[PDB]
Amino acid sequence: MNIFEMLRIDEGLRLKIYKDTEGYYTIGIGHLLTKSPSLNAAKSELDKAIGRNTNGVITKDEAEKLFNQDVDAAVRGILRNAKLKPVYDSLDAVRRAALINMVFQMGETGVAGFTNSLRMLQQKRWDEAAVNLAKSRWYNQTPNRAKRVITTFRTGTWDAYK
Numbered sequence: 146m147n148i149f150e151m152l153r154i155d156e157g158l159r160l161k162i163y164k165d166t167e168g169y170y171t172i173g174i175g176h177l178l179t180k181s182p183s184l185n186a187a188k189s190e191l192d193k194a195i196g197r198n199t200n201g202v203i204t205k206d207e208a209e210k211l212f213n214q215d216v217d218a219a220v221r222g223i224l225r226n227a228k229l230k231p232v233y234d235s236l237d238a239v240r241r242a243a244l245i246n247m248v249f250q251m252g253e254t255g256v257a258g259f260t261n262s263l264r265m266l267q268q269k270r271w272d273e274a275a276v277n278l279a280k281s282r283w284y285n286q287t288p289n290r291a292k293r294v295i296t297t298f299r300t301g302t303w304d305a306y307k
């Protein structure tokens with residue numbers, strides 16, 4: 146198990162534009178296109194992201210390219226953020242993947258706002274961090290995925306993904 150396989154489990158793979166859990170146009174492996182309600186706006190984002198006229202359908206290789214870029218962007222965003230980088234640096238490799246997963250789903254700014262959870266993770270108070278992470282819109286709206294990510298932070302194992 147690794148961050149790519151973990152996110153593939155959590156995000157799935159679809160090759161045509163569809164709406165994510167928040168109702169936002171998405172493609173591939175959880176590649177958010179736009180929060181706009183305009184499908185045309187989402188298709189333009191897709192064409193710009195892929196570099197060709199797509200009219201809403203991509204290949205698996207194209208989906209995997211966006212996914213690679215998106216995982217890279219999540220790590221890059223953690224490392225450039227003054228609140229996330231110290232937490233990331235303090236974690237082991239499994240829990241680092243759990244933090245990348247959150248940033249992939251919610252964005253750098255969203256995760257960096259979890260001030261109290263981040264402090265408990267930096268303190269390595271894993272059960273307390275897990276309880277605190279569940280007191281969130283994130284957990285309430287995607288509880289099964291959040292439970293998997295939280296179990297990864299709690300245990301430092303891949304038990305929730307195997």
Ligand code: NA
Nearest residue numbers: 273276277280
């Ligand atoms: Na708490």
Ligand code: NA
Nearest residue numbers: 287288289290
């Ligand atoms: Na869920």
Ligand code: NA
Nearest residue numbers: 296304305306
């Ligand atoms: Na589990």
